Structure formats: C-alpha cells, structure tokens
Amino acid sequence: PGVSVRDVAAQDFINAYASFLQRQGKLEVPGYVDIVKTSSGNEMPPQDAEGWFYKRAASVARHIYMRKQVGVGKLNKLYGGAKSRGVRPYKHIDASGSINRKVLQALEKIGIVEISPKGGRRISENGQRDLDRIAAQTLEE
C-alpha cells in the first residue's frame, strides 16, 4: 500500500505535481518568466510560457527527493544541454543558475526542501508529504 516517488514513472509524476503546484498557486513564480531561455545554450524560451516554471519546480523537487543533497550548480549541469556553436561543433553548456536558484528558493518558501547542513538543498518532511501523496494519487487514478 505504501507509495513513494519511485513507483511512479518520472514524466507522469512531474506532470501531475506541476499541475498540483499550478492549481495550488503558491509557487512564487519570480516574474521574469516569459522572457528567459532557461539556458545560454538554448535559443528559444520554453514553449509552455505559463507552466514551464511549475514543470521545472516539480522536476527539481523529484530530483531532490531521489538524491541526498543538490545545489544550484548540480541543477545547472543537469538541465544544461548541448549548445549549437554554429560553424563550430557542439559542447555541453550548463543551464541558468538564476532560474534554478529561484526554483530552489521557491520550494524552500513552500516547505518542500531544506537547508541541508552538509551542502545545498535537501528534501523536507512536508516535501515527502506532498510528493508521496501526489505519487499515490497518480498511481491510483
């Protein structure tokens, strides 16, 4: 009967948690959404102009839940991709630090992640309220 965020596929968990955050309406979206690219290696802003921050927040919350400690630099590398350098070959580029830092601060303000004494951010007790309840509801539907 016990369900954690490991019995649920990644994509359909992030979709459902991002939808939960959107209808909950306390994620504190910074405001410079709709202009930023999420990476200097990108060249277009997210196509889901209104929900991409919530996807990113749910993805980061799940990532913290699976791991022990994650900082912004870890998230920047994780969400970084290849950059088309034009006439030059491709190369890995880290994602936007400010977006990842503000996502983490938002989840702190909501209570999903914590100060993590030996590093960056760590999953919270309420963090594993919400992620587990979401995982249960996604599995039983």
Partner 1 sequence: AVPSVQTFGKKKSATAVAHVKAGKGLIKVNGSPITLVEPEILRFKVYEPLLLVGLDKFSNIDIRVRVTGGGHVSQVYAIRQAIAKGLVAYHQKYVDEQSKNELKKAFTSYDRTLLIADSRRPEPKKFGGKGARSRFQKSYR
Partner 2 sequence: SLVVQEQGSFQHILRLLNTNVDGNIKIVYALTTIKGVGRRYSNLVCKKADVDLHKRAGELTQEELERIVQIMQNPTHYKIPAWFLNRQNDITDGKDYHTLANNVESKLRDDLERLKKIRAHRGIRHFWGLRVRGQHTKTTGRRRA
Partner RNA sequence: UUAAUUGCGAUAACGAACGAGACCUUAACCUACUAAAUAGUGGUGCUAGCAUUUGCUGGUUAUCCACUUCUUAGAGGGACUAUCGGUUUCAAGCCGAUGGAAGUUUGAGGCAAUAACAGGUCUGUGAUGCCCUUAGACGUUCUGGGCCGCACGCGCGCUACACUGACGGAGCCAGCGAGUCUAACCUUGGCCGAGAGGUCUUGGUAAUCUUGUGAAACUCCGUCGUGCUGGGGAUAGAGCAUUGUAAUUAUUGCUCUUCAACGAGGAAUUCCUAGUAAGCGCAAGUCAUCAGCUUGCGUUGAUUACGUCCCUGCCCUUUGUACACAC
Binding footprint of partner 2 on the chain (CB under 8 A): 15, 19, 32, 34-35, 43-45, 49, 51
Residue 108 has, within 13 A of its CA and on its CB side, a CA count of 13
> Is residue 74 involved in binding RNA (CB under 7 A)?
yes
For residues 2 and 39, give the distance between their C-alpha atoms in angstroms, rounded to a whole number.
Answer: 38
Residues 21/54, Cβ–Cβ less than 8 Å: yes
* Strand, coil or helix: 79: helix
For residues 105 and 28, give the distance between their C-alpha atoms in angstroms, rounded to a whole number.
Answer: 9
Q: Which does 34 bind (CB under 5 to 8 A by kind): partner 2, RNA, partner 1, none?
A: partner 2
Nearer to partner 1, 8 or 104 (CB): 8
Q: Which does 133 bind (CB under 5 to 8 A by kind): partner 2, partner 1, RNA, none?
A: RNA
DSSP assignment, residue 3?
A: -
- Interior CA angle at 50 toward 20 and 56, to 5°? 60
Residues numbered 91 to 130 that lie near RNA (CB under 7 A) are: 91-94, 96-99, 101-102, 104-105, 118-121, 125, 128-129
Nearer to partner 1, 42 or 59 (CB): 59
> Is residue 129 involved in binding partner 1 (CB under 8 A)?
no
Residues near partner 1 (CB under 8 A) are 6-9
